[PDB]
Ligand binder design. Structure first.
Ligand SMILES: N[C@H](CCC(=O)N[C@@H](CS)C(=O)NCC(=O)O)C(=O)O
Ligand SMILES: N[C@H](CCC(=O)N[C@@H](CS)C(=O)NCC(=O)O)C(=O)O
Lengths: 221, 221
């Protein structure tokens, strides 16, 4: 059948956790790279973009926009969203805290070149003091190998993704959290993630000066 | 069972959309109002807040934090989140757009009178040209009384909520949208919303100097 088609530019940005979750669920996908402002304009005028924004994913006859609409849908389809609504609640709660810290990190490279050192320090503070202890606490509390339901879920996917970007920004920040390192190893050892982690996968690099200016032209900022 | 218990200060804030949804869905609740920074530290010390922040709702034996976790749980519990995974995706798509316009609106009063001229003009332009057309379009396509599935969903609730704040800010923005206007009248006349709209209800007023000063000292930002 059809592969989901991801509409975005050749960067991490808001499309990345979508890629991770599809690739962790072993789903093959295609990408159609926006290279210019005209490419996005073309999407807007064809009426493919409900709020005239990307990410957009074509999946199952649907033109889906809004990172959460898409992630949610994908998580459900491939059974990574828990077994019942009480499990979704814990899952939603965990990932929305992961999204909060992940939003900080995503916006960091788009910060003013001097504003960045202060912005990082807040990321170093919220990671060490707030989010990492929250997730280490959940693991220690139930003694289990995954975040919710004693079973792999999207919550496991999203968190380890974050651990990889934290490692990039400050390798020391995970050092006192051995249940998160252990989760990072277990999840990373999974056939689909391991493969997505290897070279040549559709996993994307950090922002550089090239793609940062690419993005300013394309989205108009 | 015990009434859902709501932990916040006496403001609209990130809790107000929870207040609307619970009210639209016929659910009586209790609100434990945070009145100081010391009230917030207590919840933090008692280990009540996973990420040391509110909104927090106590419901069904959980201490739920993160507006979207809370909201999503209530929607599903009360059958306002669609009949299946495909309809969830339409609703998710809509309410994330509604939440983006709402978030601009939410931050405006905390933004100082310097940028208030700039931040309000953006709400105005995006309301008129992006969001309002998107939802008018949806209502136009099926001619039905409700957004998704010819039946009250949480999208109708978050939208009509939104149409009340947009009316506060600029009563003219809806004026060229006959179907949004008529949606507002019908959701406002449903017994439970009509009751929530009545004097004396848990519905909260806009920000003012006093509430803003209180918010500064409670949340220390
Ligand atoms: N609500 C956001 C929309 C994403 C967004 O900020 N869109 C950007 C791409 S990173 C865009 O297409 N910008 C053009 C615009 O907003 O005018 C989401 O959760 O995905
Ligand atoms: N991720 C948001 C968190 C809301 C938030 O920014 N919380 C603020 C006030 S509404 C707070 O409790 N401030 C204390 C702090 O974060 O340090 C949610 O939906 O719950």
């Amino acid at each position: 059948a059809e592969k989901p088609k991801l509409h975005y530019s050749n960067i991490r940005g808001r499309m990345e956790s979508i890629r991770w979750l599809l690739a962790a669920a072993g789903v093959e996908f295609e990408e159609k790279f926006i290279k210019s402002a005209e490419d996005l304009d073309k999407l807007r005028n064809d009426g493919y973009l409900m709020f005239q924004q990307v990410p957009m994913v074509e999946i199952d006859g649907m033109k889906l926009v809004q990172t959460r609409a898409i992630l949610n849908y994908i998580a459900s389809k491939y059974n990574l969203y828990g077994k019942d609504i009480k499990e979704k609640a814990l899952i939603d709660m965990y990932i929305e805290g992961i999204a909060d810290l992940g939003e900080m990190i995503l916006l960091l490279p788009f910060t003013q070149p001097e504003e960045q050192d202060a912005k990082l320090a807040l990321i170093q503070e919220k990671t060490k003091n707030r989010y990492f202890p929250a997730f280490e606490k959940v693991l220690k509390s139930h003694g289990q190998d995954y975040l919710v339901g004693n079973k792999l879920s999207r919550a496991d996917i999203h968190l380890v993704e974050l651990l990889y970007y934290v490692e990039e920004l400050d390798s020391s920040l995970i050092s006192s959290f051995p249940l998160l390192k252990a989760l990072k190893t277990r999840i990373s050892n999974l056939p689909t993630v391991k493969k997505f982690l290897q070279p040549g996968s559709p996993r994307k690099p950090p922002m550089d000066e090239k793609s940062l200016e690419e993005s300013r032209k394309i989205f108009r900022f």
